[PDB]
Paper text:
A new H-bonds then forms with the side chain of residue D194 leading to organization of the primary specificity pocket, the oxyanion hole and other critical epitopes of the active site to enable substrate binding and catalysis.
As an alternative perturbation of the I16-D194 ionic interaction, the I16T mutant was also crystallized in the free form at a resolution of 1.7 Å and final Rfree = 0.20. The new interaction pulls the entire 215–217 segment into the active site and seals access to the primary specificity pocket. Perturbation of the Na+ binding site is particularly evident in the I16T mutant, where the ion pair between R187 and D222 is completely disrupted and the two side chains point in opposite directions. Consistent with this structural observation, the Na+ binding affinity of the I16T mutant is 70-fold lower than that of wild type. The I16T mutant also features a significant drop in activity toward fibrinogen and PAR1, with kcat/Km values about 1000-fold lower than those of wild-type. Importantly, the mutant I16T is functionally more similar to prethrombin-2 than D194A.
Numbering used by the authors:
A (entry chain H): 16 to 36, 36A, 37 to 60, 60A, 60B, 60C, 60D, 60E, ...
B (entry chain L): 1H, 1G, 1F, 1E, 1D, 1C, 1B, 1A, ...
């Protein structure tokens, strides 16, 4: 993130950090949707031009973290991956259409004050909340602070998103971020890839994961917005993967 | 079935569960009213 603020303790308890083992470093963001299922971006795991083809044994997840520079004794949890599922229609060649992956944890994580799953939207919730001008929240790490960062960003109109990039924008995508005349007031970066875009329901005061950070054209680039996988539109595939295990 | 997920999904132990508000969530809810 850029120009984010420090997360409070337990503010994003579904936040997951996807690490490489060698070197042992943060690869991408991710989110906890149950005790054994984690959502991320497909491009974090699979991008053939860059010889990026991670397997289950290449990676680990850390859960319950506020600080990237301290082992959080008696808070944070670690898991190996049992299985990666990339969306079969993931289109890395053109536009990262269906930029989503599910990862099955080898052992289920205990929930705590610091570890708790996010909700996935139903049709009603997506219809109500996923509208231009409404804000959601992106969590990630400064692109310099040592703690989880939070940025709140408005959803952008569909025509304005399309006009802001050369990439072909599909109905499986949405974009968010402040307009250029707004100035610097927070941004999601390419570095926040894989992490969740969440919205708080005024109806039931639950947090819903509406998006996954797919790519960022701002921060370290001269573009305008961040582009997100539309989680509701891929929800049948998510349910099918989880049910068929 | 997975369905709508955990009965408890999206309610934070240190916030919703304790009727405490985080420092910036009001900005999100205000954007729905405009």
């Amino acid at each position: 993130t850029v120009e984010g603020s420090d997360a409070e303790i337990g503010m994003s308890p579904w936040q997951v950090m996807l690490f490489r083992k060698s070197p042992q470093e943060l690869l991408c963001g991710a989110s906890l949707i149950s005790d054994r299922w984690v959502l991320t971006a497909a491009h974090c795991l699979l991008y053939p031009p860059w010889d990026k083809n991670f397997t289950e044994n290449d990676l680990l997840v850390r859960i319950g973290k506020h600080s990237r520079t301290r082992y959080e004794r008696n808070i944070e949890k670690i898991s190996m991956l049992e299985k990666i599922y990339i969306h079969p229609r993931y289109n890395w060649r053109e536009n990262l259409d269906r930029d989503i992956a599910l990862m099955k944890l080898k052992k289920p994580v205990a929930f705590s004050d610091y570890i708790h799953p996010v909700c996935l939207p139903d049709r009603e919730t997506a219809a109500s909340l996923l509208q231009a001008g409404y804000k959601g929240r992106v969590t990630g790490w400064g692109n310099q602070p040592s703690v989880l960062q939070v940025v709140n960003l408005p959803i952008v109109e569909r025509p304005v998103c399309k006009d802001s990039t050369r990439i072909r924008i599909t109905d499986n995508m949405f974009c968010a971020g402040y307009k250029p005349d707004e100035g610097k007031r927070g941004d999601a970066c390419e570095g926040d890839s894989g992490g969740p875009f969440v919205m708080k329901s005024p109806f039931n005061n639950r947090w819903y994961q509406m998006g996954i950070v797919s790519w960022g054209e701002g921060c370290d680039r001269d573009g305008k917005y961040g582009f997100y996988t539309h989680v509701f539109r891929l929800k049948k595939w998510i349910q099918k993967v989880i049910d068929q295990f | 079935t997975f369905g709508s997920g955990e009965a408890d999904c999206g309610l934070r132990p240190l916030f919703e569960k304790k009727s405490l508000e985080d420092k910036t969530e009001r900005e999100l809810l205000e954007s729905y009213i405009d």
